[PDB]
DNA sequence: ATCAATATCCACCTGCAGATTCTACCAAAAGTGTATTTGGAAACTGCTCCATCAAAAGGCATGTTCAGCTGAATTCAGCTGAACATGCCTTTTGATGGAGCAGTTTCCAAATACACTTTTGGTAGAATCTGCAGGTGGATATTGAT
DNA sequence: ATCAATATCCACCTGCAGATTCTACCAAAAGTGTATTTGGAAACTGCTCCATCAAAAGGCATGTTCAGCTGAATTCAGCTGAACATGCCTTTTGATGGAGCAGTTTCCAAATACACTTTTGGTAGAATCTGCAGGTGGATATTGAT
C-alpha cells in the first residue's frame, strides 16, 4: 500500500510525524506518547502560527509593503490583547508601539 | 531669525522619530567592547560568535527601553516630566530586581 | 592584546537619550546617565555570567548565540530571532 | 555535511494560506521559528507535568488539551481546542 | 476623656499586625467567595478544607505584598495616603497590566 | 459576596503592608484586584481538578495553579 | 550498607536516584553519583535554613521552630531571600515602617 | 502512602541544633522547600544535557545546574558539599 | 520640659490541652550479584568562522553657551479619613450523622512500543527573481516670532 | 491673526542585497508484524466534606467630630534642552591565518535490566510537654495643659 503522511491524514500543514518524535525525546522516563497527541499538538501550533501571520500581514498591508518584517510581527503582537499576553518574549527587530503620554504633549 | 525651537519640542520629535524606527540605538563597536570587558573579567581567553554579541545588544536595549517606560510612569505619578534616578530605583524595586 | 577598561562609558550620554526617547521619556535629569550605566552593567553581567557557564559546561571556548539565548531564558528575558 | 531542522516550510505554507500575496523576510521567519519552538515547549512542559500529577506514564491528546487551556488565554484557547479536536477526530476517522 | 491623634492608633495597628501571622480576612466570608467564583467554571464542586486554606494564604500574601508596593508609589508622590492610582501604578510596573 | 470582604479586613491587610493612611476609594479598588487574583488562580485549579476527573478541588490543585501564576506557595504539598 | 551511609549523608541517595530517573528523558540514563551530589545539596541547603531558623527561635526564647521563624531566617538573609521567592504560609512579614510615616 | 523528606529533615535538625524541635506546619514548609529545589535542579540538569545532546544526567550537570540556580556563597558551599559527598562515596 | 492622668506595653510566672515526640510491627523499595547494552569518551581531520589588520570617509560624539520653564520651596484652607464610643448581626465553633466520592483493587481490550525493510519529504547549496533601502524633490504641515 | 523657517510627507525611481525557486542525496517518516502494557472500566470501602443546629462572643457597621493632609496656587533659582562649532572613532569594505567547532569512527567504563534478598520508612496507637493565652503590677508612651 502507498504512503499517506499523517499530516495529510489530519488535514494539517504542520508535520505530525516530526512533532511526534520531538515529543518522545521529551518526557517522562518510560514516557509513552499517544498517536493523537502529536496530531492535536500540530493543530495548535499551526493555528497559532496562522493567527499571528494573519495579523502581521495586515500590518504590512497598512504600510504598503509585500514582505512581513519583524516590525510587523511586533505591531501585530502588541496590538492584540490576547497575543501580547501569551507572548511576553522580546521580538528582535521589533521596536515599541508608538505611544506618548498626554501630560508630555505640548500645552 | 535665528530660529529656536522651544524646549521640549525637539524632544517630542525624537520620541516620535525613535518609536517609529527599530534599529539599535547604542553604537555597535563600543558595546561589543563592553561585552568583552565583562566576559574577560569572568573567564579569560574567550571568543564570541558575532550573533552572540548581537543577541546581547538586542536584549539589553529591549531591557533599558522597557525600564525607561516604567521609570517614566513613576515620573508622571510624582507629577513631573523629568525622570530622575529616584524613579529608576522605584521602578526597579517594584519589578523586584532589588526589592 | 590590549587592556580593556572603562568601556561602560562607551555607552554615551547620546545613546542613553535615544533609548529614553523610545521609552517615551521627554526630560532627563543629569544624574540618570550614570544611574543607567550602572543598571545596564548589573544586567549585562548576570546574563554574560550565565552564558559563559553554559559555554564552560560544553567545554567550548566560544560563547555562542545559543548560550546567550538560554542564559536569557533562565532570567525570564526570552529573546526571539537568534535561536538558529 | 550537517542539517538543522526548521519550521520555515510549514510557516511558509500557512502564510500562503492566509495572505497569498504576502512574503516573509528572513529575520521574521527566524522569529516565527523561535515562536513555534517556544510554544511547543510550554505545551509539552505542561502536558508532562499533568501526566506526572496523575500517575500516568503517557501523554495523550487529553493532556495536550488541558495544557492548552492552561497556557492560552481566552478566545485563543477556544479556537485552538476546536482546531485540535477537529484534527484529532478527522485523524482517527481517516 | 482621652483621644489619640490621627496616625497614632494607625501606627500601633501596623506594629501590631506586622508582628502577628494570623489570616486577616474572616474565614467563612472568604470561603463563600471562593465557592461563588468557582461555581462559574464547574458546578457542584467540593473543596478540601486545606485548599480553601491555601487560597486564603496565597491571597493574603498577595494583597499584603501589593500594599507594600502601593505604599512605595504613594511615598514617591510625597503623600502618606494610598490612593487607587498608586495601586494601578504598582500593578502596572509589575506587568499584571 | 465580594462585599463580604469588609473594609476593616482590608484595613488590616494594608496595615501589615505598612500603610498608615488609607483613601476611601481603595476599598472598592482592592476588591476588584482580589477578585481578578482569585478568578485566575481558581480557573487554573479547577482545570487541574477536571483533568483528574475529580469533583473536589484539592490543595494540590491549588498549589499547582499557584505555581503556574508564578505565585509559589510553601506548606501544602509543595 | 546504604549509599547515603556510604556517601556520608542523612538524605536518601537511593530515593533521590529513583526520583531522577522518572524525570528525564525518554532515553534518560542517570549517573551513579548524580544521585549523591543532588542529595548532598538538598542536605546542605536544608542545614543552612534550619541553622538560621533555630537561631531565630533561640533569640525569641522558644524550643520549637515555627513558620514565623522560617520566614525571619529567610527574609533576613540576603542569599536565601534571593533564592526563595516563594510564600511561606503562616510566615508573616518582616516588621518595618518607613521613616516618613513615623510621627515626629 | 506518601513519601516525605520529614524524616531526613528532622535528622539534619538534630545535627545543627540538637536542642530545637520543629512544628508540623513548619515541617511542611521544609518539605515544600526540598521538593522545589529538587525540581529546579533536576529541571536545569536535564535541559543542560539536552542542549549538549546527551542522554545521561551526570554529576557534571548537577554541579553546573547549581552554579546556575544558587546565588553565590550558597553556590560555593553547595559545590563543596557536592564534590565532598561524591569523592567519599567512590572511595568506600 | 515637668506636672497630670490616661491608656499601652512589657516582663515574669502560671496550668492544661492540643499538638509533638516516642513506640509498635507489616510492604514497597533500596541493596546485591550477573549479563548486556550503550553512550560519550578518546582519537584523527575537514573547514567554518572568529580575531586581526588596513584604510578612508562622514556620521556622530563632545563641549560650550545661553536662557526658558521645570522642580522645589512655601503658604492656605477645604475637607477627607481617623478616632471613637455605640449597637447588634453574622462568624465561630463544636459535635453529628449521612454520604459523596477519592483511592484501591482486580481484569482484558485498546493502544503503544519495538524491530525491520521501503519510501518519501526536507534540507543545503545552486540558480533565478525583485521588493524596497536609501536617494530626491517639491506639497503639506508644524512651530514660534510679531 | 499672518507670514517665515524648518520639519514631515508622500510620491516616484532603480539595481542589488536578499528572497523565492530550482536540484540532489539521506535521514526519517511510513508500512508491516509481533510483543507488551496501559489506563480505562465496574465494584467497593473508608474518609473527609457538606449541612444541620444553636448558641455567646466577638467583630462589623454606623454616626460625630475635627486634626491634619492633600491639593491648589505662587515664586524663582538654576538645570537641562537646543543649537553650533569641531573633529574623532565608528562604520564598512576587503583580505588572512588558524583557532576551534563539529563530523566521524572505534569501544572500554559505566548504566541498565533482571531476579532475589533485606531493610527501612510509613502508618497508627502511646507517651510526654511546649507554649498559648491568661493573671499581676510595674515603667512607658502619649496627650492635655502652670
Numbering used by the authors:
A (entry chain C): 14 to 120
B (entry chain E): 37 to 135
C (entry chain F): 19 to 102
D (entry chain D): 31 to 124
E (entry chain A): 38 to 134
F (entry chain B): 25 to 102
G (entry chain G): 17 to 120
H (entry chain H): 33 to 124
What text appears in the publication on this structure?
Histone H2A.Z, one of the most widely distributed histone variants among eukaryotes, is reportedly involved in many biological processes, such as transcriptional regulation, genome stability, chromosome segregation, cellular proliferation, heterochromatin organization and epigenetic memory regulation, probably by modification of the chromatin structure. Two non-allelic isoforms, H2A.Z.1 and H2A.Z.2, exist in vertebrates, and a splicing variant, H2A.Z.2.2, is also expressed from the H2A.Z.2 gene as a minor or tissue-specific transcript. In the nucleosome, two of each of the histones H2A, H2B, H3 and H4 form the histone octamer and about 145–147 base pairs of DNA are wrapped around it. In the present study, we determined the crystal structures of human nucleosomes containing H2A.Z.1 and H2A.Z.2, and discovered a structural polymorphism in the L1 loop regions.
However, the structural basis of the differences between the nucleosomes containing H2A.Z.1 and H2A.Z.2 has not been elucidated owing to a lack of structural information for H2A.Z.2. Human H2A.Z.1 and H2A.Z.2 differ by only three amino acids. The structural polymorphism and distinct dynamics of H2A.Z.1 and H2A.Z.2 may be caused by the amino-acid difference at position 38, which is serine in H2A.Z.1 and threonine in H2A.Z.2. The H2A.Z.1 Ser38 and H2A.Z.2 Thr38 residues sit at the C-­terminal edge of the α1 helix, which is located just before the L1 loop. Therefore, this amino-acid difference may directly affect the neighbouring L1 loop structure. The structures of the L1 loop regions were found to clearly differ between H2A.Z.1 and H2A.Z.2, although their amino-acid sequences in this region are identical. Our FRAP analysis revealed that H2A.Z.1 exchanged more rapidly than H2A.Z.2 in living cells. However, in vitro there is no obvious difference in the stabilities of the reconstituted H2A.Z.1 and H2A.Z.2 nucleosomes, as revealed by a salt-resistance assay.
